[PDB]
A paper describes a structure:
The C9orf72 protein interacts with SMCR8 and WDR41 to form a trimeric complex and regulates multiple cellular pathways including autophagy. Specifically, the C9orf72-SMCR8 heterodimer is an effector of Rab1a GTPase and interacts with the ULK1 complex to regulate autophagy initiation. Sequence analysis of C9orf72 and SMCR8 identified the presence of differently expressed in normal and neoplastic cells (Denn) module in these proteins. In this study, we report the structure of the C9orf72-SMCR8 complex using single-particle cryo-electron microscopy (cryo-EM).
Due to poor expression of SMCR8C, we generated a chimeric construct for SMCR8 (SMCR8N-C) by linking the N-terminal and C-terminal domains with a 20 AA Gly-Ser linker. The 3.8 Å map was used to obtain the final structure of the complex described in this study, because it allowed building of the most complete model. Structurally, C9orf72 is organized into a bilobular fold, with one lobe containing the N-terminal uDenn domain (residues 13 to 198) and the second lobe containing the cDenn and dDenn domains (residues 199 to 420 and 421 to 464, respectively). Similar to C9orf72, the SMCR8N-C also assumes a bimodular architecture; however, the 2 modules are spatially separated by approximately 20 Å. Interestingly, residues 194 to 257 form 2 α-helices that fold into an antiparallel coiled coil. The interface between C9orf72 and SMCR8N-C is extensive with a total buried surface area of approximately 2,100 Å2 and is mediated predominantly by 2 interaction surfaces. The first interface (interface 1) is generated by the interaction of the uDenn domains of C9orf72 and SMCR8N-C. This interaction occurs via a β-sheet extension between the central antiparallel β-sheets of C9orf72 and SMCR8N-C. The second interface (interface 2) is primarily created by wedging of the last α-helix (helix α11, residues 392 to 418) of the cDenn domain of C9orf72 between the last α-helix of the cDenn domain (helix α11, residues 840 to 863) and the bridging helix that connects uDenn and cDenn domains of SMCR8N-C (helix α4, residues 350 to 363).
Residue numbers in the entry:
A (entry chain A): 13 to 33, 36 to 159, 167 to 336, 366 to 468
B (entry chain B): 96 to 120, 130 to 250, 314 to 374, 701 to 774, 778 to 787, 794 to 916, 929 to 936
Write the structure that this text describes.
């Protein structure tokens, strides 16, 4: 009725639950945190798992798809995020549900991640919903009488990283609040064809796609002095969902967050993993510090979705071709502001402030033209010139801050033409 | 279907004392802040009855969870302080009511009867005064730290909400805060999230007729000839007045173009919007005057002025060849909502601020500078504009002007022709 998995780190989260559905059981099997000093008693956990049970029972007409739950219990301080399954008959509520258990006062930590966590787990049920017909093996009716042994394996391994993933961000202590520009920009000026020409190539690429990718290098410090820099260009809620990569911490590519890291590229050729990169919320870069190059995947929503459609059911592409004058502007003089002082940060925000505001107009602009059948926007030729958007480097950028606000915006414009 | 679900499945089965939980949907996409309102004159001496609000998309709550569950914290707690306050006081009131029993109990028992009763009812008549006096102390401590009447018990519980209006105020204010969609809302956090670090750009420039205060300007520029240098004259300044025959219009069409004015700083606005005609005075940079006495200060202040005549069009300072104002305003524009035209205007000004921001700083352009002292540095400052992507020597004035606005405040805390055409 347990399985102990040690966690590499200091302060991991709490256990997870896998209660079954004949009579609704309090809990079937509970994963375990690291060999901590003190935990929360399983008897308490068993009730907490059983608590969602009758709460889960309250649902009617079970579902068509897997749906969410989320509990915060001030009494017996805990944060719970459970799921409801789709039954085997799809109408008979053969739900079993699962939820990692979270200590009090760590919903600030959790909630930005909440998209990550649901994503990670909802894949497990997608694997889980078959429904484990390998457990429908060639076996005698005594065996066909099964749950508590053959279900846990594919459940075990595929849920092991989740605690490590959640405990990863404590280890890779991605800057929560602020940074004094231990980033690049604090230097006077890099001043050279390659690196300075590189530095613009990445940041532009860092923007025309919403979410950056690995700083896949071999310094572990000069590797980490780019990931903290290219993240000045993202929201305070995105000070998280990023990782400051650590020297040989055996940490893979995890699809959810959209700034990442590794080191040494596995000492050889290593897969992206090509499967896991699609399961990221955005296309992303392929920044280096070894080669000082950049890459990128296709446009964020007119072709990843189509690529998503190809591969979602199965179960370094291009360089920066565009040079926004606006960012070529920005980066050119940012170093000219006599760095060392507080000046660049202010300038950065004022640069940033423009983009959101200039994004917000485009939000309002297109949503102003009443959407209708046979009535797409079709006025992009007017839109480009009208809003001071003629540099193709500049257009998609603000078109790329759209999806971060209107996720369906980018299809609303390019789906019909492309 | 149409809304009924304020408590349909918006009530978890108690599940904790103050708890705050969640529900999925099918169309619900709900959220619940379960708050019980324990009632003595009620079964179990408890009353779970939890008011919150329910919206759609499952998302405009989930990532917006804190303040909503930080104000539902304040709101729902506020009412709990009230019905208890009514309830705590009235409990001793009906204690005194049953205290009167003892006043009769003593008289009835053993007066002449010599206790002809048992009377073990007197055990009831005295035990009640204990636990009710006990839960009292429970109430006051709980106050500071940590059959028709049974449903009608909810009445005064819901009725005393109406009295203790703060609970009606917050949920009214909550219905004000969140809106139909998070995104336009979401930016407002982000917009002000950025604004905390940078405030210098705030005073140097503009930052509720704002639907009309925008829409009129769009109807202005898009179909008013010669209006182009008007913006320029207004942006550069350093003064402007506009007179008209019927004042029913200037009010309408000087709130339209009030957007463009650079406010001096931590003030309200410099648009006096009109006055009489003494015209003594760097204190007011937009005036109406709604009007040969004026024709003298018209020419006596041949510098720093401009005019209008709705009767027959005119102005005073139409010289501009650069491209900036064309970006700030192009008569062949398709911006429709006008309110959006405010945004397009509002955004651009930050860039004008941004360029202006650069010029003040860079610590290589002020009097300490590399070449020499006399005027070479003034030539040197010109090469800064090569980095600063000027439009034309007319735009040189604008960015040079904003220095003065920025130069002054850091300091405090420390010649033109004139045309006209029909």
């Amino acid at each position: 009725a347990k399985t102990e998995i040690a966690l590499s780190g200091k302060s991991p989260l709490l256990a997870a639950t896998f209660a079954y559905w004949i009579l609704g059981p309090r809990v079937r099997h509970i994963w375990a945190p690291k060999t901590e000093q003190v935990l929360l008693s399983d008897g308490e956990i068993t009730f907490l798992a059983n608590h969602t049970l009758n709460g889960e029972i309250l649902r009617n007409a079970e579902s068509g798809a897997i749906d969410v739950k989320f509990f915060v219990l001030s009494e017996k301080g805990v944060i719970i995020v459970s799921l409801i399954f789709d039954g085997n008959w799809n109408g008979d509520r053969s739900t079993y549900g699962l939820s990692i258990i979270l200590p009090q006062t760590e919903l600030s930590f959790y909630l930005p991640l909440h998209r990550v966590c649901v994503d990670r787990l909802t894949h497990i049920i997608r694997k889980g919903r078959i429904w484990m017909h390998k457990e429908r093996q060639e076996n005698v009716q005594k065996i066909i009488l099964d749950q508590g042994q053959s279900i846990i394996p594919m459940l075990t391994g595929e849920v092991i990283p989740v605690m490590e993933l959640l405990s990863s961000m404590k280890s890779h202590s991605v800057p929560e609040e602020i940074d004094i520009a231990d980033t690049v920009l604090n230097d006077d000026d890099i001043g050279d064809s390659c690196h300075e020409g590189f530095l613009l190539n990445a940041i532009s690429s860092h923007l025309q796609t919403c979410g950056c990718s690995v700083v896949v290098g071999s310094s572990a410090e000069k590797v980490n002095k780019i990931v903290r820099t290219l993240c000045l260009f993202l929201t305070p809620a995105e000070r998280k969902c990023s990782r400051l990569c650590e020297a040989e911490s055996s940490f893979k590519y995890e699809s959810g967050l959209f700034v990442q890291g590794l080191l040494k590229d596995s000492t050889g050729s290593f897969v992206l993993p090509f499967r896991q990169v699609m399961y990221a919320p955005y296309p992303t870069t392929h920044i280096d510090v070894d080669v000082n190059t950049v890459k990128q995947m296709p446009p964020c929503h007119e072709h990843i979705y189509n690529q998503r459609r190809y591969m979602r059911s199965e179960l370094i592409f291009q360089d920066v071709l565009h040079r926004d004058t606006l960012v070529k502007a920005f980066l050119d003089q940012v170093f000219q502001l006599k760095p060392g002082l507080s000046l660049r940060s202010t300038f950065l925000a004022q640069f940033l402030l423009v983009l959101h505001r200039k994004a917000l107009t485009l939000i309002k602009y297109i949503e102003d033209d009443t959407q209708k059948g046979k009535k797409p926007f079709k006025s992009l030729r007017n839109l480009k010139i009208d809003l001071d958007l003629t540099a193709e480097g500049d257009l998609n950028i603000i078109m790329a801050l759209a999806e971060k606000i209107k996720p369906g915006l980018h299809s609303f414009i390019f789906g019909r033409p492309f | 279907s149409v809304d009924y679900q304020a408590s349909f499945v918006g009530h978890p089965p108690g599940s904790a004392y103050p708890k705050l939980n969640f529900v999925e949907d099918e169309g619900a996409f709900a959220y619940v802040h379960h708050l019980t309102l324990y009632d003595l004159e009620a079964r179990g001496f408890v009353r779970p009855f939890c008011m919150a609000y329910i919206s759609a998309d499952q998302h405009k709550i989930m990532q917006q969870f804190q303040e909503l569950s930080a104000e539902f914290s304040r709101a729902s707690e506020c009412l709990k302080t009230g019905n208890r306050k009514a309830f705590a006081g009235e409990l001793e009131k009906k204690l005194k009511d049953l205290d009167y029993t003892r006043t009769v109990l003593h008289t009835e028992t053993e007066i002449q009867k010599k206790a002809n009763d048992k009377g073990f009812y007197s055990s009831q008549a005295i035990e009640k005064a204990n636990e009710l006096a006990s839960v009292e102390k429970s109430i006051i401590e709980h106050q500071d730290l940590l059959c028709f009447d049974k449903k009608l018990k909810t009445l005064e519980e819901l009725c005393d909400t109406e009295y203790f209006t703060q609970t009606l105020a917050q949920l009214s204010h909550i219905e004000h805060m969140f809106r139909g969609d998070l995104c336009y809302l979401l930016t407002s956090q982000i917009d002000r999230a950025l604004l905390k670090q940078q405030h210098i750009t705030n005073f140097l420039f503009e930052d509720r007729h704002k639907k009309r205060a925008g829409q009129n300007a769009l109807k202005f520029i898009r179909q008013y000839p010669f209006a182009h240098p008007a913006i320029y004259s207004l942006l550069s300044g350093r003064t402007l007045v506009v007179l008209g025959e019927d004042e029913a219009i200037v009010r309408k069409l000087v709130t339209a173009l009030a957007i463009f004015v650079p406010s001096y700083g931590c003030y309200a606005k410099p648009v006096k919007h009109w006055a009489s005609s003494p015209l003594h005075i760097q204190k007011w940079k937009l005036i109406g005057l709604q009007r040969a006495g004026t024709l003298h200060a018209l020419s006596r202040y041949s510098r720093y002025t401009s005019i209008l005549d709705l009767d027959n069009k005119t102005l005073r300072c139409p010289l501009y060849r650069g491209t900036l104002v064309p970006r700030l305003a192009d008569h062949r524009t398709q911006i429709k909502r006008g309110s959006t035209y405010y945004l397009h205007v509002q955004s651009m000004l930050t860039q004008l601020c941004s360029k202006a921001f650069l010029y003040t700083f860079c610590h290589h352009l002020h009097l300490p500078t590399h070449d020499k002292e006399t005027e070479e540095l003034v030539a040197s400052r010109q090469m800064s504009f090569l980095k600063l992507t000027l439009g034309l020597v007319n735009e040189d004035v604008r960015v040079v002007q904003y220095l003065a606005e920025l130069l002054k405040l850091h300091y405090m805390q420390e010649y033109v022709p004139s045309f006209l055409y029909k």
